Amino acid sequence: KKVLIVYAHQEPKSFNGSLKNVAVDELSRQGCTVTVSDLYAMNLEPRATDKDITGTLSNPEVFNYGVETHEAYKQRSLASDITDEQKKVREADLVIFQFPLYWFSVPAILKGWMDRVLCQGFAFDIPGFYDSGLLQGKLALLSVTTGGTAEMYTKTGVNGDSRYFLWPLQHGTLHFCGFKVLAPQISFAPEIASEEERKGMVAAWSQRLQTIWKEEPIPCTAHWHFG
Template identity: 55%
Template structure:
């Protein structure tokens, strides 16, 4: 008998009548209909604390003279001394096979309250170690999706648009946060400019999201440079191996949006999964 799958939606919008709220509700309905247990962390409603401080740790600090957040959090996680709000989010994340981040794009990134969730919940030890990252990451059996709204229209986020290539914008979040922790990163769900879209257009966006979620577990993740491409030693500088550079020397594009090797960026590297 197959056990019930769990999805976690990390949601950040202040208004219950927003398009983001509607996208969250569509995801809850679509996944529940498929038999998922769906957990929602409504960060604003929870008054989730965005800033990483000593309050995140119960009991004595390891080094009170020089507070180093990451070090203290790792020890507190090992000892079961993290604050209740962090421990609760970590428990949800442990259960989830699929994590959806639902938010409006703020300043080319996530709202501060989601950045606070990332900073505080994804502690060293729990979400990553220096041995367990990227392809070998702690969450390699989990999938993650960034689902977000933009203020600008799609053409503004193209390589020749005023805001620049959306693929470049997404790299720090998708590679630097999600894949770093091992997640299989699925293509982002981008709702372009819903505030200036007529009602029928907004409805069509939500229907497409619902339809996508029906087959979400069969989706291929985005492609990243395999960890084995790199010499993961201090001596090797954690750099691409010479034979990999040689292999890509004659290729028309770089490997990814960021490991571009001085070549044109592979098109839509952070927005579309490669079809084999």
């Protein structure tokens, strides 16, 4: 089994860093092939621009990012940062995203990974999306950390259910590309937690990874997210 961890945190000593490292440790111990895309260390470009296409654009006068990247994918003329990520995704059986929640979503650097890597022709086609997406047969999992507490992320709490914010990521992105989605790993409020509680949350993640290949996906439906 091949695993790609797309990791989005600036600080190696962070709680996110520890969750990433325990995932490498545990998945490596199992004998999995593991790759980490450390986006901040890579200084990944997040902006969707004409620099993402090498050589001459299909229409140099009016720039249409979607058309140009779709054609570049077909012509093997995407920027090498993009194509390097695509190779990692193509080979992976499981893609784990490890990030702190920023504005009920992914940090911009990770949003940029999604925007630039998951291009038409690679991740989906028309037709060829949702269950027919081009990354069908693969698993994806969101491993998210929050400032807010679990109680705040309940239906009656100030933030609403955590599932509510997952919709654009799980349905709109991962399911759209054909992934099956494993239940999210949400590590609530590490700053509020004691050191030993944080150790427990890292241990919980490690333990979950021991049996990750036996899990069933979640149903990636509006009902799951909002019902």
